[PDB]
Structures are given as C-alpha cells and as structure tokens.
Amino acid sequence: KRIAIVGAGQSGLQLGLGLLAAGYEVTMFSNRTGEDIRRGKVMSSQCMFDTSLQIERDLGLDHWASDCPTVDGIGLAVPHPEQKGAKVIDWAARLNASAQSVDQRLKIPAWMDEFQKKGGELVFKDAGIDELEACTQSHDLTLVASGKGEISKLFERDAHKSPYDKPQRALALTYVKGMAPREPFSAVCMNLIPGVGEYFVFPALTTTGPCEIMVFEGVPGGPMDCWADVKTPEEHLARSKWILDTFTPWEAERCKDIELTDDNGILAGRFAPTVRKPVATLPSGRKVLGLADVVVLNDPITGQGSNNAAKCADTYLKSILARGDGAADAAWMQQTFDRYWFGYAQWVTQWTNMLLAPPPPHVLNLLGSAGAVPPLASAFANGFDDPRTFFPWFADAAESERYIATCAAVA
Amino acid sequence: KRIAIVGAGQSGLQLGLGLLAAGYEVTMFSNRTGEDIRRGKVMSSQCMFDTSLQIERDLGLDHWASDCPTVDGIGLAVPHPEQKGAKVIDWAARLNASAQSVDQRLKIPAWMDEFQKKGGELVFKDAGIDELEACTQSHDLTLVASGKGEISKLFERDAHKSPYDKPQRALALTYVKGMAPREPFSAVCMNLIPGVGEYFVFPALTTTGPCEIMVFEGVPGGPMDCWADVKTPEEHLARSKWILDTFTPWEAERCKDIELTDDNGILAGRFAPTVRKPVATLPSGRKVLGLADVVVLNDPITGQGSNNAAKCADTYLKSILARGDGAADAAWMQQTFDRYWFGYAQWVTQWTNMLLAPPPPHVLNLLGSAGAVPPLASAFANGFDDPRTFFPWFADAAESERYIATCAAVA
Ligand SMILES: Cc1cc2nc3c(=O)[nH]c(=O)nc-3n(C[C@H](O)[C@H](O)[C@H](O)COP(=O)(O)OP(=O)(O)OC[C@H]3O[C@@H](n4cnc5c(N)ncnc54)[C@H](O)[C@@H]3O)c2cc1C
Numbered sequence: 001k002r003i004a005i006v007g008a009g010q011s012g013l014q015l016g017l018g019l020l021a022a023g024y025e026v027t028m029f030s031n032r033t034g035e036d037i038r039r040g041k042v043m044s045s046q047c048m049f050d051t052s053l054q055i056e057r058d059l060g061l062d063h064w065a066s067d068c069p070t071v072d073g074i075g076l077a078v079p080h081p082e083q084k085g086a087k088v089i090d091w092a093a094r095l096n097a098s099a100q101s102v103d104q105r106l107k108i109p110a111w112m113d114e115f116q117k118k119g120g121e122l123v124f125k126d127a128g129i130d131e132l133e134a135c136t137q138s139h140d141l142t143l144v145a146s147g148k149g150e151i152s153k154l155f156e157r158d159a160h161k162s163p164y165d166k167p168q169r170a171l172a173l174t175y176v177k178g179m180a181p182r183e184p185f186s187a188v189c190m191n192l193i194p195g196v197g198e199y200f201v202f203p204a205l206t207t208t209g210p211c212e213i214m215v216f217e218g219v220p221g222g223p224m225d226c227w228a229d230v231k232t233p234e235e236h237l238a239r240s241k242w243i244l245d246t247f248t249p250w251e252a253e254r255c256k257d258i259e260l261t262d263d264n265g266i267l268a269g270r271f272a273p274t275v276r277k278p279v280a281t282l283p284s285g286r287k288v289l290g291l292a293d294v295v296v297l298n299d300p301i302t303g304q305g306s307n308n309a310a311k312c313a314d315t316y317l318k319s320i321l322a323r324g325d326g327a328a329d330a331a332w333m334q335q336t337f338d339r340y341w342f343g344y345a346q347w348v349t350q351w352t353n354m355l356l357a358p359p360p361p362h363v364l365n366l367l368g369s370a371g372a373v374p375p376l377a378s379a380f381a382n383g384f385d386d387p388r389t390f391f392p393w394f395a396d397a398a399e400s401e402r403y404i405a406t407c408a409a410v411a
Numbered sequence: 412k413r414i415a416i417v418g419a420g421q422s423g424l425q426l427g428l429g430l431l432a433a434g435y436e437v438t439m440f441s442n443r444t445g446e447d448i449r450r451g452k453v454m455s456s457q458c459m460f461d462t463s464l465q466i467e468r469d470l471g472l473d474h475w476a477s478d479c480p481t482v483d484g485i486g487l488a489v490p491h492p493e494q495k496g497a498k499v500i501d502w503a504a505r506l507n508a509s510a511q512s513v514d515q516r517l518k519i520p521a522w523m524d525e526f527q528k529k530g531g532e533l534v535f536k537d538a539g540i541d542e543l544e545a546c547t548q549s550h551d552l553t554l555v556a557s558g559k560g561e562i563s564k565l566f567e568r569d570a571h572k573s574p575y576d577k578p579q580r581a582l583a584l585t586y587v588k589g590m591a592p593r594e595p596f597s598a599v600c601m602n603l604i605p606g607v608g609e610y611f612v613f614p615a616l617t618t619t620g621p622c623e624i625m626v627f628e629g630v631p632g633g634p635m636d637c638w639a640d641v642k643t644p645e646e647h648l649a650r651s652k653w654i655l656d657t658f659t660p661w662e663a664e665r666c667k668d669i670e671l672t673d674d675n676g677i678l679a680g681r682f683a684p685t686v687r688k689p690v691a692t693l694p695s696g697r698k699v700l701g702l703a704d705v706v707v708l709n710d711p712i713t714g715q716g717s718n719n720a721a722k723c724a725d726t727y728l729k730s731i732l733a734r735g736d737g738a739a740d741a742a743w744m745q746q747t748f749d750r751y752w753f754g755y756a757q758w759v760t761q762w763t764n765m766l767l768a769p770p771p772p773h774v775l776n777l778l779g780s781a782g783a784v785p786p787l788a789s790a791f792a793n794g795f796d797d798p799r800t801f802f803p804w805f806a807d808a809a810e811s812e813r814y815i816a817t818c819a820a821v822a
C-alpha cells in the first residue's frame with residue numbers, strides 16, 4: 001500500500017495521483033520546486049492526442065481542457081524542388097477527436113499541488129542511489145520516473161530494442177505569441193524538408209496564455225542543425241524565423257509579428273533514442289521499476305513522448321491495482337513493462353525510428369498519395385493517436401500499395 | 412442520430428445499448444425471440460478476459476458479474492509420449508484479473524430486453540437485402556452484426572487477410588454439471604494433443620446455473636474429428652467422455668459424475684477463419700458497415716471471438732460518437748474498421764492462424780520453458796487478454812529465445 005516514485009514529471013505525477021485516488025500512500029521525490037518549474041525553461045511541445053487526453057479526463061486531471069486551444073488536424077507540406085517558394089505536397093486531414101498541448105510548466109506544478117492536497121508525501125531532493133535504497137526498505141514498490149535525468153542511466157540500455165546510439169535530430173523549441181491562426185481549422189503543421197529536417201507548429205497553452213509552439217528537428221550537421229551559435233532569446237527567435245524564411249516561406253507568412261511568449265520559452269538539445277531494461281538492481285539487491293521515458297525514450301519527431309507517458313502510467317496503474325496484496329517482485333515489474341512494450345510502445349518506437357531515417361520510395365509515395373486520397377490522409381492523421389495502426393502498410397512497400405488501394409476505393 | 416443494426420448478437424447489442432445511452436435512436440433486427448435463444452442450442456464457450464469484461468462494466472452491462480464463476484488462470488498440459496497417462500508439460504499461471512464466461516443464451520436475450528426498455532426499436536425478421544435497402548434510406552448508418560449468418564457473405568472475402576479457405580478444426584461444445592472443481596484456482600485448462608487437437612475446459616454460467624464448458628477442437632480427419640456419427644445428447648456426452656478417456660485421462664478423473672446442463676448444451680460444427688472487407692454496397696449503391704464476426708471471424712482455438720466482439724463494438728461506438736454530425740460514408744466506415752484491424756485484430760488473427768497450424772520447434776520450446784520459468788507462463792496466460800503482447804517473440808525463433816531469457820532473469 002506504500003508506493004515511492006522518484007521524479008515529479010508527467011508519468012510520475014499521473015501515476016501518483018491515480019494511486020492516491022485508489023487509496024495508496026505515495027511518496028514522491030522532486031528535484032525542483034513547482035514555481036521554478038513554472039518559470040523555468042520549457043521542456044516539451046507535449047502534443048497529446050485524444051486517447052492520452054482521455055486517460056487524464058478519466059482521472060479528473062484535465063484541468064486545462066477548456067482554456068487550452070484544440071489541435072484539430074494534421075497537415076503535411078514538402079517544398080517543391082523545381083518551383084520557388086512552393087510545395088509539391090500540401091495536404092491536411094482532421095483528427096477524429098482534438099489533440100491538446102498543455103505546457104508542462106503549467107501541468108506538472110499544478111499536479112504537484114494536487115498530489116499534496118490529495119495526501120501525497122512530496123519530498124524535495126535530487127534523489128540518488130541512497131534515496132532509492134531508503135525507499136525500497138520503506139515502500140512496497142519504488143518506481144523511477146525521472147525522464148532524461150542522469151539517474152535514469154541506472155537502468156541498463158537494451159541494445160536489441162535500441163537501433164540508435166547517437167542522436168538522430170538536433171532539436172529546438174520556440175514558444176511564440178502573435179502567429180496568424182491556421183484557418184479553417186488548427187493542425188499540427190508538419191513541414192518535411194528532404195534531407196534537411198522538419199518544422200512542426202501548432203497552438204498550445206502556456207503560462208502567459210494561448211500560444212503556438214514552433215518545433216525544429218534537423219538532420220545532424222545539416223542546415224537545420226543550427227543552434228550552437230545561438231546564445232540569447234533574441235538570437236533564438238531570429239534563428240527560428242531564419243529557418244522559416246530559408247526553408248518554409250509559406251509558414252513565414254504567418255510569422256511577421258511573432259514574439260517569444262517569455263525568454264524561457266526556448267529550448268535546444270538532442271538525445272539518442274534509447275530503450276532500457278525496466279528492472280534495476282540496487283547495490284543492496286533491492287529492485288526498482290522504471291517508468292515512461294526512463295525505459296522508452298523516443299525522438300520527438302512523432303510527438304509521442306507525453307502520449308507514451310500517459311499510456312505507460314495508465315498501464316502501470318492498472319497493473320498495480322490488479323496486483324493487490326501480491327508481491328511487487330522483479331517478475332511482476334518485468335511483466336508490467338512487457339505489456340506496455342509488446343502491447344504498444346514497440347510499435348510507437350519502431351515507427352518513430354523508421355521516420356528518423358531517410359524515407360524510402362514507398363513512403364514518399366504514401367505521403368504524395370495522401371494529398372489525393374483523403375482516407376489515406378485521415379489514416380495518417382489519426383495514426384498519431386495510435387501508431388499501431390500504421391503497421392504493416394507504412395513499413396512495407398507491397399502493403400503500402402494495398403492500403404493506398406483500400407483507401408482509394410472509399411474516397 | 413438514427414442507427415440500424417441487423418443482428419441481435421453480442422457486438423450488435425453492446426453497440427446498440429451504448430448508442431441508446433448516448434442518445435441515439437437505434438433500430439435492431441433479430442431473427443429469433445429472446446426466449447428461443449435462451450432455450451435453444453448453445454452458441455459459444457464465450458470466455459471473456461478482463462479488458463473485454465471491463466468494456467461491459469463501463470456500459471453497466473455486467474449483469475452476471477456476481478453470479479458467474481470466475482476463471483482465474485490458464486493451464487497447459489501435453490501428454491507424455493513415453494509415459495502412459497502422464498503429461499510431459501503441465502503448468503499453470505494466474506490471470507492478473509479474472510475472466511468470465513456468461514452463456515450467450517443468458518446474455519443476448521437479457522440485453523435484448525434491456526435494449527427495448529432503454530427505447531430501442533426491436534424488429535423481428537430474418538433480414539435480407541430488402542431490409543438493408545430500407546434501413547439505409549431511413550437511418551444515418553446501418554451495420555450488419557449477423558455473426559455467422561448467411562447475410563454476412565454480402566461482404567467481400569478479403570483474400571489477403573484470410574490465409575485459410577477451409578476449416579482448420581472440427582469443433583464441439585459440451586456444457587456439463589458435476590465436474591470436480593479445479594483446485595486451488597480455476598483455469599482455462601488447455602490440453603494440447605500433438606497432431607490430434609485440443610481439449611479446453613473452464614467454469615461458466617448458463618441457464619441452469621454454474622457449470623463447466625468442455626471445448627473440443629480436432630485436426631480435420633484426425634482422431635478428434637469425431638462428431639459426425641453423434642446424433643443424440645446422450646451420444647454427445649458419451650463421445651465427450653471418450654475423448655477424455657482416450658487422450659486426457661487426468662481430466663477424465665474430474666468427470667466421473669458429469670451430466671449435461673440441458674439437452675441443448677451441446678454443439679458441433681466447423682468454419683473457415685475468414686476476414687472480409689467492411690463496406691458492402693447494396694444494389695441501390697447505398698452502403699452498409701460490417702461489425703465483429705461479419706468482418707473478422709477466427710477459429711475459437713484462442714478464445715477470442717467474444718473478446719473481439721466487445722472490443723470491436725467499443726471501437727465502433729467510439730468512432731460513431733466522435734463523428735457527430737459528420738457523414739457516415741464509406742470512407743468513415745472503412746477507417747473505423749481499419750483502426751480495429753490494424754490497431755488490434757490483425758494481431759489476434761495472425762496469432763490464432765499460427766496456432767491452428769502445427770507448432771514449429773521454437774513454439775514447443777516456449778511451451779516447455781513456461782513450465783520452468785513462471786514469468787513466461789504468466790505472459791502466456793495474460794496474453795489472452797491482449798494478444799498483441801505475443802509479438803514478435805511468439806512467431807520468431809530468435810526473438811522467442813530472447814524473451815525466454817528476459818523471463819528467466821526475473822524468475
Ligand atoms: C523538444 C521536445 C518536444 C516534445 N514534443 C512532444 C510532443 O509534441 N508530444 C509528446 O507527446 N511528447 C513530446 N515530447 C516528449 C515528452 O515531453 C516526454 O516524453 C514526457 O515528459 C515524458 O514524461 P516522463 O514522466 O517520462 O518524464 P518527465 O515529464 O520529463 O518527468 C521527469 C522529471 O523527473 C525529474 N528528475 C530527474 N532526475 C531526478 C532525480 N534524480 N530526482 C528527482 N527528480 C528527478 C526531471 O527533472 C523531470 O522533472 C517532447 C520532448 C522534447 C524534448
């Protein structure tokens with residue numbers, strides 16, 4: 001009945017709050033105060049699709065549902081190689097239900113407050129092996145939910161589930177006010193620059209109200225791997241507009257008057273996609289269980305990290321509740337992760353890792369056909385809500401052709 | 412807001428009831444009266460695992476939860492080729508949450524009564540193309556939920572998703588009272604007879620109270636393809652015991668005093684696993700949407716048909732609710748099925764179709780290792796609740812060995 005969680009993030013707090021509502025005692029370790037999270041740097045573009053949003057709704061945790069702008073579709077654009085400032089692919093499709101991006105600077109601290117108000121024990125410290133040893137002696141289960149924190153490396157990298165050992169994109173975020181709203185519906189506007197990278201943009205909610213989030217991913221060493229010399233917020237805004245001027249002038253038209261939401265609405269960084277083994281053994285021989293990004297870390301190119309966090313925490317919560325008085329031993333830990341991995345996250349991960357590599361011809365054919373076959377475009381858009389639905393037709397040429405034909409027959 | 416459903420079965424009635432609760436008008440066609448279903452032949456062994464049961468719970472339709480015996484694990488036995496009346500494999504694993512088998516003779520008629528009481532329009536007729544033409548003119552969406560009925564063949568067989576065009580097992584059911592309860596927990600007791608077939612048995616709820624259901628599947632033309640000469644209920648009980656005496660004497664020990672629950676608690680039959688295209692076009696050019704067994708029909712060897720029916724109806728209900736005022740056109744129909752198929756049922760189907768074929772050596776190695784590696788046995792048992800979790804390790808030798816090793820490391 002006593003559960004410890006190290007890491008006050010999306011998955012950790014969602015899980016902790018669910019556990020409290022089910023009558024558990026929860027101890028949570030945070031390495032930052034709520035206010036410093038609210039006023040510190042952005043951490044994500046956190047676009048959450050309907051299934052993930054519903055997990056939050058069902059826990060009563062959708063506190064921003066009304067104030068957060070909805071994201072109502074997906075758009076895909078590719079520059080025309082032979083026509084200046086034009087697109088050779090330019091289509092959109094509505095999501096069957098809205099997505100929403102609630103800044104973690106808002107959500108995490110408010111969920112920390114809710115966790116305390118609901119009886120959770122919040123302990124402030126940069127937790128290390130010593131805290132894990134203490135927790136495993138006083139609690140029935142200890143989870144590590146520390147995201148990209150250094151303590152996550154306690155869990156052993158799973159080479160067979162990790163095809164990459166190096167970052168595959170250089171990342172940046174810029175939160176802005178004043179962007180012209182997309183008409184006639186909002187979308188994740190995806191701009192695929194062949195051999196260069198990707199620009200994504202969609203509306204969101206941050207600490208100063210509604211905004212849009214510009215998301216940049218660059219092939220390393222390419223023209224969009226361009227944040228090393230950026231050292232001020234003003235330079236970051238400028239480099240953001242420069243990418244749009246240089247590679248997506250149609251989006252630059254929307255950004256004549258953009259300003260940062262705040263000087264901390266910027267980020268630049270990179271990481272290697274990594275899957276880890278879920279059970280870590282401490283020096284004492286006691287065991288801890290890894291949660292969400294600790295065990296499955298994907299590049300954000302597919303916008304799945306916060307979705308994975310919600311769905312991972314939901315699966316772990318269900319597994320804890322079903323266990324009851326049963327031992328929280330390594331076998332149960334491993335089985336809990338396995339259901340998440342084989343049931344769901346292996347397909348999110350395989351899809352994302354394929355998209356990081358150069359697209360093969362059948363993929364370019366799918367993206368083009370989607371502009372002329374609306375049901376295929378819809379499949380693409382709503383696949384973001386459950387990436388299992390891309391298999392087997394996204395990854396195999398012959399199956400992709402069969403699926404295009406299925407889609408064309410009902411257009 | 413007006414929906415028609417042809418076929419008053421598990422998926423059709425679950426969907427209809429959900430639609431009524433959401434404020435839709437529902438017309439349903441039934442080819443039998445509730446009472447004739449209650450007192451007619453059994454139709455299934457309908458073992459529903461926790462995720463499917465929860466879909467019913469969330470609609471408030473788990474009316475037998477308290478009276479139906481729980482099924483609390485899975486067991487696997489294989490006869491010893493060199494030791495008389497002994498088993499070379501004999502293991503069991505608990506399900507993380509209970510399964511339950513509520514006879515469709517009970518559930519379907521009670522759900523028909525609930526459907527009328529909740530404002531549904533129940534129309535009694537053996538529906539054909541004429542009723543479909545009428546329904547498609549007076550309703551926004553018409554679904555065909557007719558199971559193994561002849562009208563299901565209106566939907567075009569999908570050859571690429573259907574590796575079989577012939578039955579792969581000869582089936583029989585025998586519902587009995589007086590079987591010795593399994594101790595110390597109930598289970599689906601799976602008896603795999605190499606090259607011959609399978610005997611499954613578990614407790615259930617039928618019209619005369621708790622029982623056990625004996626399920627027989629025989630390789631066609633083999634020793635368990637043995638129901639052609641059976642012509643009375645007494646002969647059916649006798650042939651049931653004969654299989655146990657001949658192939659599973661350890662189960663015969665439990666059946667010294669078994670009697671039929673009723674003369675109609677028996678069934679024999681066979682069918683080819685079949686996947687169909689979900690949109691059918693009527694002579695007028697109007698369109699209908701296929702539901703559950705109409706579009707994805709699997710052999711019962713994996714006990715997934717009623718689970719598929721609950722999960723399919725849940726996905727279709729979610730899709731209808733998200734559509735709102737949107738057109739219920741062929742594109743939307745196809746996309747609704749696609750989410751079900753690519754997201755879930757393709758993996759149930761591939762797994763089941765593999766199990767119907769002779770098991771390759773790595774599969775026999777998995778089944779043996781599970782007897783000595785409890786976490787692998789648990790994976791097997793709980794995979795019945797979500798067969799996606801068998802992939803890729805069940806179907807590939809090298810991956811199966813990796814998963815055995817993962818399981819052994821936490822045993
Ligand atoms: C640029 C970018 C864009 C993204 N865009 C999207 C998107 O559009 N959609 C989407 O779904 N996902 C997106 N993601 C991913 C998403 O933000 C994360 O996957 C999600 O936050 C994972 O949740 P988590 O609970 O595993 O970790 P987090 O939410 O990161 O929580 C971990 C927390 O634990 C803390 N911590 C670390 N070490 C310790 C320690 N020793 N003791 C205590 N606390 C510690 C960390 O500081 C952090 O506060 C994006 C990520 C990035 C980097």
Ligand SMILES: Cc1cc2nc3c(=O)[nH]c(=O)nc-3n(C[C@H](O)[C@H](O)[C@H](O)COP(=O)(O)OP(=O)(O)OC[C@H]3O[C@@H](n4cnc5c(N)ncnc54)[C@H](O)[C@@H]3O)c2cc1C
Binds near residue numbers: 539556557703718
């Ligand atoms: C021997 C056997 C054992 C099984 N064991 C299991 C198990 O352990 N676990 C499991 O999950 N599944 C099992 N199944 C599968 C499960 O019973 C079915 O998959 C499930 O009933 C499918 O639901 P459905 O709504 O698609 O069809 P049904 O529940 O069969 O509903 C279809 C209904 O429509 C009626 N109908 C047909 N034609 C017409 C028409 N023209 N007009 C009106 N009505 C019509 C039919 O008579 C029937 O009443 C088993 C099946 C069999 C045969």
Ligand SMILES: C[S@](=O)c1ccccc1
Binds near residue numbers: 190192302355380
């Ligand atoms: C590169 S972005 O994530 C994408 C995903 C699917 C289809 C097209 C583009």
Ligand SMILES: C[S@](=O)c1ccccc1
Binds near residue numbers: 047201
């Ligand atoms: C722009 S962020 O990386 C994203 C990408 C794809 C889908 C949703 C969100």
Ligand SMILES: C[S@](=O)c1ccccc1
Binds near residue numbers: 713
């Ligand atoms: C033949 S029965 O369905 C089965 C399934 C999984 C593992 C072993 C046996």
Ligand SMILES: C[S@](=O)c1ccccc1
Binds near residue numbers: 456458612711713714
């Ligand atoms: C005995 S019925 O066919 C069954 C098989 C496997 C799992 C559950 C139910």
